[PDB]
Amino acid sequence: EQWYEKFKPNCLEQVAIHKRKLKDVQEALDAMFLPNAKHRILLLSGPSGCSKSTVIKELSKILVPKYRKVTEFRGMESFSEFLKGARYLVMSNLSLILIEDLPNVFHIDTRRRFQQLILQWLYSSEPLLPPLVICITECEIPENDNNYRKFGIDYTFSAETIMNKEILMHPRLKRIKFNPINSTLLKKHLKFICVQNMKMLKEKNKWNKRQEVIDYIAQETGDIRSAITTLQFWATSSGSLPISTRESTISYFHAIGKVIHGSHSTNNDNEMINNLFENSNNLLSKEDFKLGILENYNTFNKGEFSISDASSIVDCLSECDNMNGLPESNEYGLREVRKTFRNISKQGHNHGTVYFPREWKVRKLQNSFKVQAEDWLNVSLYKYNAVHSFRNITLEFGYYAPLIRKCQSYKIDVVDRIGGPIE
Amino acid sequence: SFKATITESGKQNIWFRAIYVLSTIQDDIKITVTTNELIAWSMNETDTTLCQVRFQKSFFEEYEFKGVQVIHKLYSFRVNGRHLTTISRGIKSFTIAVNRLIVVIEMDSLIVKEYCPQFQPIKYDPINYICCNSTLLKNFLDNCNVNVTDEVKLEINVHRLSITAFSMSNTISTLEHYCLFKSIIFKLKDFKNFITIGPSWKTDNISLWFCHPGDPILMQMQKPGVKLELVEVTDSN
Amino acid sequence: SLQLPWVEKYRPQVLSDIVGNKETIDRLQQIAKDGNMPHMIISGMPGIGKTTSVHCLAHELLGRSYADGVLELNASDDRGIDVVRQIKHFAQKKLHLPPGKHKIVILDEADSMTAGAQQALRRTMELYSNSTRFAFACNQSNKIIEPLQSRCAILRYSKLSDEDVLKRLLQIIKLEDVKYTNDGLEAIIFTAEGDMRQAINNLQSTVAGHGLVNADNVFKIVDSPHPLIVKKMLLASNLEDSIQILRTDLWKKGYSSIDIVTTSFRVTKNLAQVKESVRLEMIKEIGLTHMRILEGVGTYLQLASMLAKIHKLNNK
Amino acid sequence: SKENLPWVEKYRPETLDEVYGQNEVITTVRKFVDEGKLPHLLFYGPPGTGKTSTIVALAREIYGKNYSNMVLELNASDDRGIDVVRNQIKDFASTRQIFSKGFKLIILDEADAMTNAAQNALRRVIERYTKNTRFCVLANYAHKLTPALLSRCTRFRFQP
Amino acid sequence: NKFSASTVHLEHITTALSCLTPFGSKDDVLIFIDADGLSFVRENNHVIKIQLLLSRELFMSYSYRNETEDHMKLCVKINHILDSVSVMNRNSDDIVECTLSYDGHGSPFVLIFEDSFISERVEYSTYLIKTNGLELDRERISFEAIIKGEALHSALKDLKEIGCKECYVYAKTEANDENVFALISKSQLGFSKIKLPSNRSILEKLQVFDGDSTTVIDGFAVIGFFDFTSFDKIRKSTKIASKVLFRMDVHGVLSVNILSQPGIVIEVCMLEKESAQTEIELLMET
DNA sequence: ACGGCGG
DNA sequence: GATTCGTATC
Ligand SMILES: Nc1ncnc2c1ncn2[C@@H]1O[C@H](COP(=O)(O)OP(=O)(O)OP(O)(O)=S)[C@@H](O)[C@H]1O
Ligand SMILES: Nc1ncnc2c1ncn2[C@@H]1O[C@H](COP(=O)(O)OP(=O)(O)OP(O)(O)=S)[C@@H](O)[C@H]1O
Ligand SMILES: Nc1ncnc2c1ncn2[C@@H]1O[C@H](COP(=O)(O)OP(=O)(O)OP(O)(O)=S)[C@@H](O)[C@H]1O
Ligand SMILES: [Mg+2]
Ligand SMILES: [Mg+2]
Ligand SMILES: [Mg+2]
Structure with a gap:
């Protein structure tokens, strides 16, 4: 049929996966096939076409007939009925259950049901359970049709957003992140396919010029399936049809690094910025990206650059923060940051490591402070007929009121600085 | 090749109810075809339940017979349950025949309705005894909601038989053929449907064949021209 | 009909x-x-x-x-x-x-x-x-x-490309036996800007309106792409000519100020032969003008001020 | 009546005679009406230039007493x-025009306020039922309309 | 009062209102007041129109003292009327005498409910008027079928149960008494057909003409491609229909005439789609 | 007359 | 995209 379906691996050695990752997956899987196995779930996450399920199928074609099929799901509570009958696959029915089919997680209700049902699976009191494996493909979700929801699963389709922290942190859940197929494996396999089609490629007179495309494809995509599809399309072609492969999305920190340091592929700042906006406007249009720029522009040279440049960068960021959510604001801010870091960049710089903004922690602390202040206010209102504005609680009482209400206690009420101390 | 006709009221009702239960077990209901019987059956996503209903040639006014798999020749095919459950939903002559299935409906008001549902050829995929009455289990099971109770316990004793849908429970005094020659747990969304197929052709005993907790349990009912079979898995350990 | x-x-x-x-x-x-x-x-x-x-x-x-x-x-x-x-x-x-x-x-x-x-x-x-x-x-x-x-x-x-547009236009013309001249078809292709549907629509409109596809008849009912007039306005040397374009070819022709600002943003993004610092400064000025337009001040003075600021940041 | x-x-x-200032577009649309073929039109210009009046008078010289059913x-x-x-536009376009005055007309006044999803869905209603209906789009700001919609519409500019 | 009508058989007007619900449930309703009777007209998307008529004989008193104009037109919303009469029918078992009233342009539509103890009075606000162009040509009928109400209602219910995204109608009368009338549906099941019988109790009369309603010919069929969204608007009206008359001309307008048992007359006009024809012919020759 | 067909 | 550790291989 199709090369990515006709040349599918028949053994693990034909699977395009790294040796160490393969070892980790193998040992984890075998440990999940033990009578009382610490780990109940195996959440494999990664980009598309990284042999996430290919390797699982091959491994369950060996492990299953050793301690005992893959029983794949077919995507409100239909998944409940499926999993209500996916637990009887016990010994003599041990059949690694693979959930590559995700019950619709773009819908709030069945997303919560998916999460709260996999939790019940995690906390099940049954003494014997089948090895549960979930494959989630990390793919940025494009810009919708004006969707004003703009929720978590409306920006990125990732495990973190489908599952809840507890699910992903549960001691009995093992997560093995997957990486794009390296060019070594990609060339090694795209050449095996060519020594199986050297006949047609010879009569086509492309068998001679095969390693050029085998290398260009291996350098353009980490997707094995897309690589094989592009190879099939080029081989069956006649003329000099352009070799185009699928397009992948950059990461958040990848985009930050591109803005700060740049990209080797392009030494043009304008072209790089325009392409980043064109292909990635679902992240370059979120305030967290500008917060990341502010938090990580000091990771250039480990923070050993002029103060004038830092002042210019932060001043521009502040100016663009009052330009509303306009498209020009980000295009100005990122361009200014890149220009500033381009003029000062040289050779000999041991750049630092970037980090995610801590604004979420500050917001959580603000919420905690609010919760603290409210108790003080109502206590006063019921015990001293006292109404105090939250502004005065945050500027005067938060500090004086607990000091007095504790010192008088020193000789129901608050004895500690409202919202914790200032450090 | 195939031409079958149903020309009675209760027979149409049993056909409808069996078709709906097969449709609610699997989206595509599976019908195989034999020169002496008509076999309809379904499957589950996790391969747990197996409900099969067989219609003998005496159940139809005419049963002429002239993909194909030999074992006696046998045609097996798949057709959508939800589509064909509305066709079988007064009727004077219900004719079914055969790349799309052919079914003819002739109303008592001389209205003839024609449908052409598409079908896909496929291949055929073929202790203690309890003979409790169907209605006693019916009244209890119709009082159990699938959403709130999922499993049913079948504890058989020589003194009495008590069934618990779990913890709503009911007890039936010992039953006609309680041959022990125990405890069994299985699902409920299909048991109620299976026990409610039979009581549609009014003119009523269910047979429970189970061996071990890890072995499947078989349900059998008898009709003058209809055969009923259900096999469900039970928790191994 | x-x-x-x-x-x-x-x-x-x-x-x-x-x-x-x-x-x-x-x-x-x-x-x-x-x-x-x-x-x-x-x-x-x-x-x-x-x-x-x-x-x-x-x-x-x-x-x-x-x-x-x-x-x-x-x-x-x-x-x-x-x-x-x-x-x-x-x-x-x-x-x-x-x-x-x-x-x-x-x-x-x-x-x-x-x-x-x-x-x-x-x-x-x-x-x-x-x-x-x-x-x-x-x-x-x-x-x-x-x-x-x-x-x-x-x-x-x-x-x-222009050749694949000209070839299809020639086929359609031979099928519709309309009259043309070389300059008229060149103008039709120029206003099409790589669009076959727009080229066909413009040719149909020109044939219906007048019948002869020449430059004058094409240009009196089809306007030259305004992105190109925005680009011409933004690349002017002195402010006189830039404001002159903004007025004659954009304001008195009926184009809205917000349309001019959005087109200027895209033109600046795709502009060539301009330094990156100049480009980002122009982006900032265009963003400020867009903010002023969206807040209600949709006046020609705001656009004139934007062009003045662009010239000021160009000449230094 | 019309004095208050x-x-x-x-x-x-009420007629294309009384629309002044816009001469080229009026001449072109009159010739289009007489020739019997009317393409998908798009009227662009400043407010109060005579776009709604022009299209309504055109649809009164194209239909007549059935200007309310066509x-x-x-x-x-x-x-x-x-x-x-x-639903509404698709059912208006799919139905037949009782043969009255050839094609039916759909006037989308103030299309710049329409959401992008609606404009994107209208693309395959404009070019599928073009044999029975012709769409007219009136807008003051062209930046709010999808480029695909602009592609399939003939642009006439209403000058000040 | 320029118009006044009184009745106690409120079930008739209730059925009139429930037969007007299928044509949208929150929109404007046109009421035409003339000496002959009381008529409600509704139009949806310029593609389908209903016209119910309550004759003078349905009211003991029907004055129409208006003299300046022969007919009076008013536009009132249907959601207001529905929401009012819904709570008024709470005690419908009482002997209620409904009284319609209208004093002319600018005056509200009054609807008084008197139980001999309580006289509820409601004044419905009248809106400006935006409905005849959607009428078949009487000299161009291509087929004329008279069908029983119950059979048509059953067929429509079946088509609803099958989904029936699109619908087709057939009208062929062959040389003998071979009156063929079928309602083909394009549904999930595929290509489903509901054939009305040729017997005279269900299909009283089928006559196919050459677009002039005068020349009868056999062997030729008239095909109507209709959207079932519009075709289901007559189901609620056929539910109470004794006999249903179907008429279509070559311009693609289907006029469903429903008569109830005197009762109420319902006229539905439906437009035909642009448009499978050979598939229709091959399925019905088979 | 009772069972089935908001985030 | 950067650093740091760890291989695998020529
Ligand atoms: N050497 C190879 N190793 C692995 N997969 C291969 C190879 N050659 C061909 N394939 C095929 O490439 C495809 C890779 O699919 P997978 O990566 O397993 O699915 P996936 O990771 O979920 O990708 P997505 O996100 O679903 S598109 C399969 O259809 C394989 O049969
Ligand atoms: N060319 C014209 N000749 C005569 N009167 C005109 C002309 N253009 C506009 N008017 C008058 O201005 C009024 C408003 O113009 P319209 O055509 O209704 O609206 P418009 O010109 O389309 O502007 P917008 O975009 O709808 S706000 C009309 O009702 C006329 O009275
Ligand atoms: N390559 C071509 N050669 C000739 N005419 C073409 C060509 N492409 C488009 N056209 C014309 O464009 C019209 C059809 O437009 P489409 O090709 O459907 O446009 P499109 O490429 O699909 O763009 P979208 O996605 O619909 S906005 C007809 O008038 C064709 O004659
Ligand atoms: Mg996969
Ligand atoms: Mg207007
Ligand atoms: Mg297209």
């Missing part, structure tokens, strides 16, 4: 009448004959032949079974996850096609589909790949999720 | 979401 517009009257019916993308069109014809058409995603800009090529491919491939073989779904039709769960019965349908032929599901405007629909389309494309094939047609390929693009062969249609 | 109306509404043109006028005062486009 019986004539059809030239855009639809002369829509190609065979792959040989689709100008441009020579290599892509040749590949499509080869797929039409050989068969075994892979999953494809056809991107590009408006008016290039992304749907006139997928429909022609489906015609020349399925042929007589083009009624039970081509399940066409587009934005005008509902395409929720429920629809994707019409796309399943069509795939499960068995039709006796010639060897090498497969059913085609033409999902026009796949960039507007919901993500749940795409996540289910993956299931359909995985379980029924041996009987039916999917032909996505879109304007921006990034709107299709990466797992779907992984299973498909991406074919990007480039902008139609 | 504001002068802006009392002096609304023309479907939707504007910003009406909901024009994705459901509206998929």
